[PDB]
Paper text:
CEP120, for example, plays a key role in the duplication, elongation, and maturation of centrioles, which in principle could impact the production of a functional basal body (Comartin et al., 2013, Lin et al., 2013, Mahjoub et al., 2010, Wu et al., 2014). All three C2 domains of CEP120 (C2A, C2B, and C2C) adopt the PLC δ1-like topology II and are structurally similar to each other (root-mean-square deviation [RMSD], 2.4–2.6 Å), with major differences found mainly in their loop length.
To obtain this crystal form, we introduced an additional mutation (G307S) that we found serendipitously. The CEP120 C2B (H.s.-A199P) mutant structure revealed an overall preservation of the C2 domain fold and only subtle structural changes. The replacement of this alanine by proline causes a change in the main-chain dihedral angles of the preceding residues, resulting in a local structural change. In the WT structure, the main-chain carbonyl O of O.n.-Phe199 (H.s.-Phe198) makes a main-chain/main-chain hydrogen bond to O.n.-Gly333 (H.s.-Gly333) that cannot be maintained in the A199P mutant due to the conformational constraints imposed by the adjacent proline residue. In the mutant structure, the loss of this hydrogen bond is compensated by a peptide bond flip, allowing the main-chain carbonyl O of O.n.-Ala198 (H.s.-Ala197) to form a new hydrogen bond with O.n.-Gly333 (H.s.-Gly333). Other structural differences between the WT and A200P mutant, in particular the conformational change in loop 1 and loop 3, are most likely caused by different crystal-packing interactions.
Numbering used by the authors: 168 to 341
Write the structure that this text describes.
């Protein structure tokens, strides 16, 4: 199963076009970054202003970049939503989402990743038990991790203040 973009119609076909004809909307919201400064080592001194950061992920092969921000201590980040339209059948779409790799969201500087988190799209498929009547949403604050630590250190506990990003993934009929 693959999501084929129909450029003139602005949706992605999942399944046979003559059998799978229902319209769905898959939305990703990113919001409320916290403690992003902890993704940068304390021995790396950034100048007060002049840096530009943003968030990136890929949604069904579509590149999604947030508005830029310049202060890791206070991103002042307005919540941002991206949505893709999908023409499929309820059962085919769930199977497709169950086979997808995790949604990977990066804190970026240029083309460098300062940290990333994974959001399970197969978990969204599992809770999509009532799409005829209610949209299904996977939502939480997800922990951001830097790309490469040199040595193993004592892991942070889930109760600890770590870099996090609010991520909500919602699936519904159109």
């Amino acid at each position: 199963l693959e999501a084929i973009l129909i450029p003139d119609q602005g949706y992605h076909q999942v399944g046979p076009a003559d059998l799978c004809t229902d319209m769905f909307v898959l939305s990703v919201t990113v919001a409320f970054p916290t403690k992003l400064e902890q993704l940068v080592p304390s021995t790396m001194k950034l100048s007060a202003e002049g840096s530009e950061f943003f968030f990136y992920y890929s949604l069904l092969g579509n590149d999604i970049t947030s508005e830029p921000f310049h202060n890791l201590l206070s991103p002042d980040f307005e919540p941002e939503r991206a949505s893709v339209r999908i023409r499929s059948s309820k059962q085919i779409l769930k199977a497709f989402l169950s086979q997808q790799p995790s949604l990977q969201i990066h804190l970026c500087c240029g083309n460098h990743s300062l940290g990333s988190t994974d959001v399970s799209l197969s978990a969204l498929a599992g809770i999509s038990t009532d799409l005829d009547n209610k949209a299904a949403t996977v939502e939480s604050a997800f922990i951001l991790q830097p790309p490469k630590r040199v040595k193993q250190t004592l892991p942070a506990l889930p109760t600890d203040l770590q870099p996090t990003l609010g991520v909500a993934v919602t699936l519904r009929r159109e």
